[PDB]
């Protein structure tokens, strides 16, 4: 069985299986395949949200700390974190800014808390397997009750995630190279 | 002070003494309270180490024991 | 009390029995040597521990071995004279 | 003044270097005459017997002192040993495995741990 | 029947030998007792730290020493002794003021470097460390209860199958687990402790050493070198960066073994099984031996590098701190070094299972196969070093007594000089490629002379002989040609009788007893070398190739201030030093009789004395001797007591000399 | 028949030969037979036939010998390049001394030399087992 029987390896021309793995990592690391699918789904979801929030600020910009909330999508990370002391280290000597402190570290700490009580709580305490890889039981009531419908919905999630990962890479690289608007072209 | 040794006399090394008290009596008493706590706890620990483990507690002691869920994992993870 | 053990390599010298100053050892009949006799230590409670038996034993390594047990000493194993423990 | 801590010293030094040491020595010589004295290193104390029996009462440590503990199916082991000895038994030898093991387990050492008779 | 007077010595000789306990029946009890003892010992250490901090806070002058550290002297604690003169003034007090003692530990520089400025901070630190002692004792109680609760949970435990008894081996998996312990030690206890100390330095130590600066920016991590000019110590920025680097490296290393999950990390057993090891890692004596052998290089390098590269403020400016610290840590590491071998011998006696006769698989097996070759070659190198060091020293002594200093044999220390030249070229290349050059390294490289070569050969001789005695004891602990049953007996036992040639000092413990004298002698040589080179580098460089120089220009000459301490002319503040000097001489000589005179003489003497007591009118009607029968000390107890007296005398005779010579 | 010493020795030999084979089996359960003790872990035999089994190299057990050889040589080249370009050619010490920063590529690469050593060890181990 290819890659422990995970959704995502089936071709689209049907009657065929893309089972894309030129490096053969699925057979080299079968004990970390659930972690591989966890990472793939996490990257896909983060990249979907990242592409959406790479397009949107070109139109609407939340009015806030003017130090951030300004500039191109490229100059929006190092600007919305400011000259932190070393890296993601709050300046306790001068909280309330007045020189150097973060503006996203709140997003960072929220992501850390959610991740620890999310993936870490799923793996360390009293358990992830092949089937429950990306399944955090979030919005499963919306999932249809049919064996193939769930499988095709998961496949659509996976393929949208891969497309969003590649799309975000291309979009951010083009924006860095050129600037410009949504087309991200010279 | 009457110094001894060649270097103290030939260099003028001196030992200053504070004219104040150092610690007030209240601070010494505050330290002695926690020292007494250490002392009581250490006497209890010495008693427990002297008597050692009692395996026959399961015949008389209440409860049913407990193995923490991580201790079970550490048991079955290996040695 | 010490522990005096006799091993199969005994050849019935009787020298160990003769050297014992407190009559700990004795000769018993056996069939494992040409002498048809081996030593025995039926009264090691009287073994002071002088190890004269080990000095007298001529086998390659002593057929009689005395194991000292200092946390075990009795009045007989200490040779107490001025003091009685009974 | 730099002194005024000697008010603590004049009580503590005599106390902890005379009263406590003397009380400790008297308590130690009193403890030396208890039947429980040095029960962990001195053989033949009552508490040592009680502790050993308490360990033996635990279901895990019942057959803990037996050097042969571990044989999951001792009957299978004994049967296999008897079968292996039958094919190697010398000529008309009259020794069986059962009595051979029984007489190899029974030695004659009366003066071993005889200190388990006072406490 | 009951016991004799030797019961006290017999009990106290194994008072902490938890393996020899009578109630202890399993590794669970042994491991839990050891863990609780560890907790109590940590509590003792914390209370000792709080003690020093309190006495510096209360009975001391830290607030004044911090202002002018170079010429000032710290105070250890007050003197309250009713035996002094209630009149006049002692030489340890400024007339009517209280009596004080000068601290030679070095805690003042430690606290000053760490960022302490006020007495109040030291008081709060004392309170916190007493709190930590409470916490440690409570953790001991907690773990005793948790293990007893597991034991009680065996009242609701059964596998429904005969394999349930397997749980017997996993009850102490909390203590006996190795992979988790290694992972968490090397990661947390080493790397993250270093990283936390880097944080401490960046937040306090560097801020409280210079003018106010930026918000602890990454410019606080420097790569200067050593010996900041003003304080004559390492740069605090360099120390913080060093701890940061060590912390990062050890944190990365700590993810090696399979600690919490079975899917990450390699097992230590599999690591050893595919190497030249695969030892019995379940032995507690083996682990103790190989970690004592780890604290030994650490403590020896601590002694070397506290002096060579002084890390504390104004530590090099104290002529007594620098020698006392070095000698103290050298003695500590010598004790740990001999401990490693002693517990290796105990491991071989008690906790080592060997193949039948020929299976050369275990490392100890392969060592034991050719142990005679090891001991013979160690004896050869020891003999060579002793012969050729003593003979050259004798040549120098004789030819310099005969008015011929130029007839000496002075081998120039060429190899050490080459190593020093290479290191100096490397350091100078480092310095020359700096825009902030003109740095100093203090005594990292020192002038090396023929006297240095001879003393190094003497030190190598001492180390070789100590290792020879210890290694012979370890290898023949399980049986030698003289006594081919030594593993049937205890680790320490009296002898094997006067027959078979005579068998005094035959146990492995007797090998340790013999080796402790050589450990003390080698440490004395090392300490004499360091102290002599510290007192006068020039005179050591020239006149130290003949032993008469060591006897005269060091011992006889430098003992002048100490003996003059108390005399019929008045007393100095060295009076305690001279009195302790004489007391330690008495202690050293008192242990000679426990070593030279042996038991039987004294047993007859005790029989005569007991005859007197049972013959004295009143005593006989109150005390017949049947209860606690007085007996002469047993042979092993006698050897140990003589060794203790000898060690105490030899060790404690030196600090008075150090204080008299340097202060 | 009487039990001669030779017959007793024969019983000793028979008993030892039988029991030494029996105790290796699943029916003796000694603490020295636990995981982490003498016996190998259940699914991970380390040494068989006097040869390092494929399970020694851990997660690399599935790698081919050619893949490990290529990785070994590539890592050796990259790590040696990093070490030589950090120490002797293109030194970074002067650049970082004046307030600069290390060429992070050199630092990352230089750690691939011992990795390459163990990678080529693993390549040989894989080749021996025919993988
Ligand atoms: C300096 C080392 C030293 C010392 C102190 C002693 C002391 C002694 N030896 Mg001895 N001995 C030594 C080395 C020494 N030996 C050596 C190297 C050998 C070579 C083998 C011998 C061989 C030897 C033999 C063969 C004999 C002795 C005997 C004696 C005893 C007779 C002297 C006596 O009773 O005085 C009293 C003891 C003193 C130490 C005098 C000083 C006492 C102090 C200063 C006063 C009390 C202090 C005070 C109470 C403090 C309290 C303690 C504190 C904890 C509170 C005595 C206990 C003989 C004996 O026991 O016969 C009676 C005997 O037969 N010795
Ligand atoms: C990977 C996702 C991601 C990341 C890292 C960022 C990061 C950033 N965004 Mg952004 N954004 C995103 C997605 C993301 N965005 C999406 C999906 C939208 C569309 C609503 C926007 C719309 C948006 C605007 C309008 C602006 C930013 C801005 C910024 C910058 C300042 C931070 C801020 O306040 O954002 C604000 C972001 C939001 C209010 C949208 C949050 C939506 C999150 C991603 C969904 C919640 C995820 C949660 C963990 C899952 C549970 C909920 C789920 C059921 C949906 C920062 C670089 C500001 C800036 O300076 O731009 C240059 C700004 O003005 N973003
Ligand atoms: C305090 C903050 C915090 C913490 C504790 C975690 C914790 C975790 N994250 Mg994570 N994450 C965070 C913030 C945080 N996240 C943020 C802000 C983002 C961006 C939105 C992500 C994006 C992210 C992704 C995309 C992935 C994780 C993954 C993980 C898991 C593995 C981490 C690992 O091995 O590190 C590795 C350490 C590194 C330094 C990574 C190397 C840098 C790469 C190669 C670039 C772990 C549960 C992984 C996971 O869940 O695996 C299934 C995973 O794939 N995280
Ligand atoms: C794990 C140990 C440890 C701890 C507890 C702290 C704690 C602190 N550091 Mg810190 N630090 C450490 C190690 C540590 N440091 C090391 C090893 C470095 C070197 C990389 C730094 C470099 C550093 C900088 C550069 C800064 C801090 C700052 C701070 C403060 C707020 C930062 C924070 O995360 O608050 C929650 C806080 C007192 C910041 C601060 O407040 O400045 C004084 C700041 O600017 N630290
Ligand atoms: C035939 C004489 C002879 C020979 C060839 C050797 C050879 C050896 N001995 Mg040696 N030894 C000898 C006599 C001899 N020994 C005597 C008489 C003693 C008693 C003092 C020793 C005591 C001794 C010790 C304690 C050690 C050796 C060791 C060694 C070995 C290393 C070399 C060494 O240390 O030499 C140095 C030799 C000495 C220090 C001993 C003194 C040399 C004697 C005086 C020479 C006598 C020669 C003899 C008089 C010739 C007469 C010839 C005539 C009758 C025709 C080497 C195999 C060492 C070893 O085992 O390491 C591998 C070691 O540790 N030997
Ligand atoms: C001045 C005191 C002194 C001296 C010179 C020696 C000399 C020696 N001891 Mg020794 N020892 C001493 C005191 C002394 N011991 C004490 C007090 C103890 C405590 C019991 C020991 C315990 C001890 C042990 C346990 C061992 C030695 C060993 C040695 C030898 C080391 C090899 C060597 O250098 O040979 C060179 C020979 C000389 C320098 C003697 C001079 C020869 C002529 C004059 C030239 C050597 C014979 C070791 C040994 O046998 O090594 C092979 C060894 O195993 N000694
Ligand atoms: C320098 C010596 C060295 C050597 C020869 C190995 C060798 C090995 N390690 Mg390892 N490791 C090392 C240092 C080393 N490591 C260090 C310093 C760390 C801490 C970061 C680790 C952390 C580590 C983990 C976490 C794991 C390994 C694993 C492995 C095995 C698989 C190799 C692999 O996939 O790596 C490429 C292999 C036997 C893996 C394994 O097989 O475990 C069962 C595994 O899970 N190692
Ligand atoms: C400065 C101080 C440094 C000097 C101290 C150095 C001492 C070296 C430490 C070595 C200690 C370990 C050796 C040891 O304990 O066993 C040394 C021996 C070991 O005891 C022997 O043990 C054997 C079993 O292993 C047998 O049972 C022997 O019969 C028994 O004598 O201990 C004694 O003999 C102790 C007798 C003296 C007891 C004095 C009590 C001390 C009270 C004051 C505190
Ligand atoms: C209680 C509760 O809540 O339950 C929850 C459960 C759950 C599951 C969390 C939920 C959900 C689902 C969610 C939130 C789904 C969101 C999905 C998103 C945002 C997908 C974006 C994909 C973007 C792509 C593919 C971009 C593709 C972009 C491409 C290909 C770009 C292509 C470009 O060529 C173009 C077009 C321009 C060129 O210049 C270059 C580039 C950029 C490459 C619910 C509904 O909330 C309910
Ligand atoms: C830049 C910047 C920042 C940033 C950033 C970020 C997030 C940068 C992210 C970069 C990122 C995310 C880059 C992804 C690349 C993905 C690639 C190359 C995929 C190739 C995929 C290929 C070539 C696929 C090929 C195939 O399809 C082919 C042709 C046939 C198919 O049958 C099969 C396959 C699959 C084989 C900071 C640091 C945050 C702040 C700073 O201030 C500004
Ligand atoms: S001396 Fe030895 S060999 Fe002779 S009879 Fe006695 S025990 Fe046997
Ligand atoms: S040690 Fe002495 S008393 Fe004991 S059996 Fe031998 S000879 Fe007899």
GROMACS .gro file of N, CA, C and O and ligand atoms in nm, chain A residues 34-44 46 107-116 118-121 123-124 128 136, ligand 3:
model
  175
   34UNK      N    1   0.219   0.979   0.954
   34UNK     CA    2   0.118   1.065   1.016
   34UNK      C    3   0.169   1.205   1.045
   34UNK      O    4   0.096   1.303   1.024
   35UNK      N    5   0.294   1.218   1.090
   35UNK     CA    6   0.351   1.350   1.111
   35UNK      C    7   0.370   1.424   0.979
   35UNK      O    8   0.353   1.546   0.972
   36UNK      N    9   0.407   1.351   0.873
   36UNK     CA   10   0.421   1.414   0.742
   36UNK      C   11   0.288   1.470   0.693
   36UNK      O   12   0.283   1.581   0.639
   37UNK      N   13   0.179   1.394   0.711
   37UNK     CA   14   0.049   1.444   0.668
   37UNK      C   15   0.002   1.559   0.757
   37UNK      O   16  -0.061   1.654   0.709
   38UNK      N   17   0.032   1.552   0.887
   38UNK     CA   18   0.004   1.665   0.975
   38UNK      C   19   0.074   1.791   0.926
   38UNK      O   20   0.013   1.898   0.917
   39UNK      N   21   0.202   1.779   0.892
   39UNK     CA   22   0.278   1.894   0.843
   39UNK      C   23   0.223   1.943   0.710
   39UNK      O   24   0.214   2.064   0.687
   40UNK      N   25   0.188   1.851   0.620
   40UNK     CA   26   0.135   1.891   0.490
   40UNK      C   27   0.005   1.968   0.505
   40UNK      O   28  -0.014   2.073   0.443
   41UNK      N   29  -0.086   1.918   0.589
   41UNK     CA   30  -0.214   1.986   0.608
   41UNK      C   31  -0.195   2.120   0.679
   41UNK      O   32  -0.262   2.218   0.644
   42UNK      N   33  -0.105   2.125   0.777
   42UNK     CA   34  -0.079   2.252   0.844
   42UNK      C   35  -0.023   2.355   0.748
   42UNK      O   36  -0.066   2.471   0.746
   43UNK      N   37   0.074   2.314   0.664
   43UNK     CA   38   0.128   2.405   0.564
   43UNK      C   39   0.021   2.450   0.467
   43UNK      O   40   0.014   2.568   0.432
   44UNK      N   41  -0.065   2.358   0.423
   44UNK     CA   42  -0.169   2.395   0.329
   44UNK      C   43  -0.267   2.495   0.386
   44UNK      O   44  -0.302   2.593   0.320
   46UNK      N   45  -0.221   2.703   0.652
   46UNK     CA   46  -0.152   2.829   0.676
   46UNK      C   47  -0.129   2.903   0.545
   46UNK      O   48  -0.140   3.025   0.539
  107UNK      N   49   0.019   3.762   1.786
  107UNK     CA   50  -0.013   3.653   1.695
  107UNK      C   51   0.078   3.535   1.721
  107UNK      O   52   0.035   3.419   1.718
  108UNK      N   53   0.206   3.561   1.751
  108UNK     CA   54   0.301   3.454   1.777
  108UNK      C   55   0.262   3.374   1.902
  108UNK      O   56   0.263   3.251   1.901
  109UNK      N   57   0.225   3.444   2.010
  109UNK     CA   58   0.192   3.373   2.133
  109UNK      C   59   0.057   3.302   2.120
  109UNK      O   60   0.039   3.193   2.175
  110UNK      N   61  -0.038   3.362   2.049
  110UNK     CA   62  -0.164   3.292   2.025
  110UNK      C   63  -0.142   3.166   1.944
  110UNK      O   64  -0.198   3.060   1.975
  111UNK      N   65  -0.059   3.174   1.840
  111UNK     CA   66  -0.027   3.056   1.761
  111UNK      C   67   0.045   2.952   1.845
  111UNK      O   68   0.020   2.832   1.830
  112UNK      N   69   0.135   2.995   1.933
  112UNK     CA   70   0.204   2.900   2.018
  112UNK      C   71   0.112   2.828   2.114
  112UNK      O   72   0.118   2.705   2.130
  113UNK      N   73   0.024   2.903   2.181
  113UNK     CA   74  -0.073   2.842   2.272
  113UNK      C   75  -0.164   2.746   2.198
  113UNK      O   76  -0.185   2.632   2.242
  114UNK      N   77  -0.217   2.788   2.083
  114UNK     CA   78  -0.306   2.702   2.006
  114UNK      C   79  -0.232   2.578   1.957
  114UNK      O   80  -0.286   2.468   1.961
  115UNK      N   81  -0.107   2.594   1.914
  115UNK     CA   82  -0.031   2.481   1.862
  115UNK      C   83  -0.001   2.380   1.971
  115UNK      O   84  -0.011   2.259   1.948
  116UNK      N   85   0.037   2.427   2.090
  116UNK     CA   86   0.068   2.337   2.200
  116UNK      C   87  -0.058   2.264   2.246
  116UNK      O   88  -0.056   2.143   2.271
  118UNK      N   89  -0.286   2.178   2.070
  118UNK     CA   90  -0.344   2.142   1.942
  118UNK      C   91  -0.270   2.020   1.892
  118UNK      O   92  -0.313   1.910   1.917
  119UNK      N   93  -0.158   2.040   1.825
  119UNK     CA   94  -0.075   1.930   1.776
  119UNK      C   95  -0.001   1.860   1.890
  119UNK      O   96   0.000   1.737   1.899
  120UNK      N   97   0.060   1.939   1.979
  120UNK     CA   98   0.136   1.880   2.089
  120UNK      C   99   0.045   1.799   2.181
  120UNK      O  100   0.082   1.689   2.223
  121UNK      N  101  -0.073   1.851   2.212
  121UNK     CA  102  -0.169   1.776   2.292
  121UNK      C  103  -0.224   1.656   2.217
  121UNK      O  104  -0.270   1.561   2.281
  123UNK      N  105  -0.035   1.466   2.013
  123UNK     CA  106   0.071   1.367   1.999
  123UNK      C  107   0.130   1.321   2.132
  123UNK      O  108   0.148   1.201   2.153
  124UNK      N  109   0.159   1.414   2.224
  124UNK     CA  110   0.230   1.376   2.346
  124UNK      C  111   0.140   1.303   2.446
  124UNK      O  112   0.173   1.190   2.485
  128UNK      N  113  -0.198   1.021   1.759
  128UNK     CA  114  -0.237   1.040   1.620
  128UNK      C  115  -0.195   0.920   1.536
  128UNK      O  116  -0.093   0.856   1.562
  136UNK      N  117  -0.871   1.748   1.363
  136UNK     CA  118  -0.883   1.805   1.497
  136UNK      C  119  -1.028   1.814   1.541
  136UNK      O  120  -1.058   1.884   1.638
 1267LIG     C1  121   0.553   2.953   2.045
 1267LIG     C2  122   0.527   2.928   1.916
 1267LIG     C3  123   0.508   2.799   1.853
 1267LIG     C4  124   0.527   2.671   1.900
 1267LIG     C5  125   0.573   2.621   2.030
 1267LIG     C6  126   0.491   2.579   1.788
 1267LIG     C7  127   0.498   2.439   1.797
 1267LIG     C8  128   0.495   2.352   1.689
 1267LIG     N1  129   0.482   2.384   1.557
 1267LIG    MG1  130   0.446   2.579   1.491
 1267LIG     N2  131   0.409   2.769   1.414
 1267LIG     C9  132   0.404   2.883   1.490
 1267LIG    C10  133   0.430   2.891   1.630
 1267LIG    C11  134   0.460   2.787   1.713
 1267LIG     N3  135   0.452   2.650   1.679
 1267LIG    C12  136   0.374   2.998   1.405
 1267LIG    C13  137   0.362   3.135   1.452
 1267LIG    C14  138   0.364   2.950   1.274
 1267LIG    C15  139   0.336   3.028   1.153
 1267LIG    C16  140   0.188   3.054   1.132
 1267LIG    C17  141   0.386   2.805   1.281
 1267LIG    C18  142   0.384   2.718   1.171
 1267LIG    C19  143   0.409   2.582   1.177
 1267LIG    C20  144   0.412   2.484   1.066
 1267LIG    C21  145   0.389   2.515   0.925
 1267LIG    C22  146   0.445   2.362   1.124
 1267LIG    C23  147   0.457   2.387   1.269
 1267LIG    C24  148   0.486   2.268   1.343
 1267LIG    C25  149   0.498   2.268   1.479
 1267LIG    C26  150   0.524   2.146   1.568
 1267LIG    C27  151   0.666   2.097   1.549
 1267LIG    C28  152   0.768   2.203   1.587
 1267LIG    C29  153   0.907   2.164   1.551
 1267LIG     O1  154   0.954   2.051   1.534
 1267LIG     O2  155   0.990   2.272   1.536
 1267LIG    C30  156   1.093   2.264   1.436
 1267LIG    C31  157   1.188   2.376   1.463
 1267LIG    C32  158   1.223   2.467   1.370
 1267LIG    C33  159   1.317   2.577   1.400
 1267LIG    C34  160   1.168   2.462   1.232
 1267LIG    C35  161   1.275   2.479   1.125
 1267LIG    C36  162   1.242   2.595   1.033
 1267LIG    C37  163   1.179   2.549   0.902
 1267LIG    C38  164   1.263   2.440   0.838
 1267LIG    C39  165   1.164   2.666   0.806
 1267LIG    C40  166   0.502   2.201   1.711
 1267LIG    C41  167   0.377   2.145   1.774
 1267LIG    C42  168   0.494   2.156   1.242
 1267LIG    C43  169   0.395   2.048   1.275
 1267LIG     O3  170   0.289   2.060   1.338
 1267LIG     O4  171   0.430   1.925   1.229
 1267LIG    C44  172   0.323   1.838   1.193
 1267LIG    C45  173   0.467   2.220   1.102
 1267LIG     O5  174   0.467   2.156   0.998
 1267LIG     N4  175   0.438   2.516   1.299
   0.00000   0.00000   0.00000
